[PDB]
Amino acid sequence: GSTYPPTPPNVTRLSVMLRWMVPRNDGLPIVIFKVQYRMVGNWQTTNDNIPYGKPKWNSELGKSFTASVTDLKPQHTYRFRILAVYSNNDNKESNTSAKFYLQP
Numbered sequence: 001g002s003t004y005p006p007t008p009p010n011v012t013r014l015s016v017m018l019r020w021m022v023p024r025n026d027g028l029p030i031v032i033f034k035v036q037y038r039m040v041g042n043w044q045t046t047n048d049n050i051p052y053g054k055p056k057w058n059s060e061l062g063k064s065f066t067a068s069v070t071d072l073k074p075q076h077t078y079r080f081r082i083l084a085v086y087s088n089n090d091n092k093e094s095n096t097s098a099k100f101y102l103q104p
Contacts, residue, residue, distance in 0.1 A: 002027035003092045006065075006082045011100040016069045020082050020094060022052075023062040028090070034083040035069060039076050040099055045083070074104040 004025035009018035022030060033050040036043045050067055057063045072078065078101075082094040 001086070001088055001090075003084070003086050003090055005092045006030075006033065006084050006094040008095045008097045009080050009082055011078075011080055011097050013103065014068055016072060016078075016080075016100065016102065017066060018069065018080055018082070018097075019064060019066045021062050021064045022084070024057055024060075025062075028086040028088055030084045031087055032085050033065065034085065035067065035080065036083055036093070037069065037072070037078050037080045039078055043081075072102055074102045077101045 004023065004027040007021045009020040011018060018035065030052045032052065035046045035048055038044060046069060048067065050065065077099050079099055080097040083091055085091045
């Protein structure tokens with residue numbers, strides 16, 4: 001089955017807020033998302049397993065999701081990406097986010 005990738009997350013200050021979207025598509029449904037990050041310059045996965053849940057879409061464009069990441073070391077720049085896990089157990093990563101400096 002086809003695996004439509006989520007968009008990269010837009011990163012804003014909070015801790016870090018990540019907002020991404022799963023565009024409307026007819027591919028396989030998503031079960032959960034995982035959040036990955038790395039310092040600018042190896043990818044690590046946080047412990048959060050974000051459910052796709054309901055509803056299916058929350059706008060004409062698709063479904064937007066907003067979550068947060070905690071306990072990251074400030075005074076460093078990071079990149080983030082969203083891993084989508086599909087109902088057939090395949091998975092696919094979003095493109096990487098823009099760089100984000102975490103202010104102390």
